[PDB]
Prior knowledge:
Two copies of one chain form a homodimer.
Chain A: E1 3-8, H1 13-23, E2 29-32, H2 34-40, H3 43-51, E3 56-63, H4 67-76, E4 81-85, H5 90-102, E5 106-111, H6 117-126, E6 130-134, H7 137-141, H8 148-159, E7 163-167, E8 185-188, H9 190-193, H10 198-212
Helix pairs in contact in A: 4-5
One L-guluronic acid 6-phosphate sits between chains A (7, 9, 33-34, 60, 112, 134, 137, 167-170, 187-191) and B (65-67).
Amino acid sequence: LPMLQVALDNQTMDSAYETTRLIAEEVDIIEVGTILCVGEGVRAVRDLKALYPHKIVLADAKIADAGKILSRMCFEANADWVTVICCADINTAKGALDVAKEFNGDVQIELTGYWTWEQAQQWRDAGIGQVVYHRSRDAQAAGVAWGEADITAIKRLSDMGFKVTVTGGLALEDLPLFKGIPIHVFIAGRSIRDAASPVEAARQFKRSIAELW
Amino acid sequence: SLPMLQVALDNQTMDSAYETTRLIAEEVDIIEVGTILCVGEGVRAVRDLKALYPHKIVLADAKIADAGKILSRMCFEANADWVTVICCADINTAKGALDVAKEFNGDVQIELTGYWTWEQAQQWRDAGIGQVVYHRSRDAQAAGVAWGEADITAIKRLSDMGFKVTVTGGLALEDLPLFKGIPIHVFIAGRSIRDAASPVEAARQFKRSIAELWG
Ligand SMILES: O=C(O)[C@@H](O)[C@@H](O)[C@H](O)[C@@H](O)COP(=O)(O)O
Ligand SMILES: O=C(O)[C@@H](O)[C@@H](O)[C@H](O)[C@@H](O)COP(=O)(O)O
Ligand SMILES: [Mg+2]
Ligand SMILES: [Mg+2]
């Protein structure tokens, strides 16, 4: 079954705790959004893991360069997974993975923005086993919706051997679109953080997921 | 015009960054809060440094990839002068960051680290972006990738496109002559200045060399 991941795109830790104190036990993965990494620094990862050690903590650092330096900082802060932006040099993705192996963590390729299938092949050959298919937030606000092109690419990535995470302003009604595909993880940020009842929002995703998968 | 000198502070903590700034703040033109420092300390790095050097241009190398209006605003509210947007970012992300930049009389730079296309370069121009950072990846450098004709060609073409170009990537004094004849806007030095026996003398040697090759 696809796991449920909550994106913490808050600017301060106290803001993030308003959400985790409610749904921490309702999700599988607690992500330190890029906005939180830049707002508080890597201490966000260290503090959240200390609070929820039984959960998977993802540092959405979107590493672009200095792969072994930035990943080591996240894993030393106890992160389980870290993200590497899709346009990073292949040596950058490789370095982060090498470090991740030292901590028994893992690396994800953030497919935010422009990327190609040739790069996708390179990531496989490098040994990367996870990708995050992301519909850009700025793109969404510009009227961009989910479509067949996305479904097709997602299926293709899956056929390549990647464990695929789908994210990007996902609402409970968007789940049916991905039925049939073995999605590894579904990410929900605003739809859970900003719902009237975050707990009900989280449980409904879980419910819908178990029902469709 | 003479290319300016910018020091990249890719430190993990503020105190480590200050060991350098207390020495060369007045020897360089632009003080950069490297990505590593941002992730290490958070946006407070930008605010503290600007309060220390208000007369200097402070760049936040945030490498914005999405949520361009939110992240840029965070950096600008912390008093950054310039912010960087990673090259693969959706064009709307770059536009949104630029829109916020105008509100704070700041500016945006497209960070050319990794894979990008000329078609994308045209879009940045159309969007009104005036600065790009040609970067030779640090991980590629360690992999044995040196500065070559391929880079010079691209840099020249970006310059002809109307972009003010910044060059960076493990630059050493020996590499500067490779860019002679090109109207480079800024030369960024990180390790070559932070790790020298005498950072002050390292910074001055870069300046002297720049004045000699571009004067
Ligand atoms: O670009 C970013 O860093 C976020 O906008 C993005 O990764 C975000 O964390 C999404 O993955 C989940 O958040 P939403 O469901 O609210 O889009
Ligand atoms: O990718 C990064 O964040 C840095 O590795 C990179 O931007 C760095 O700041 C260089 O631009 C300057 O540093 P060096 O001269 O040491 O390569
Ligand atoms: Mg995220
Ligand atoms: Mg930098």
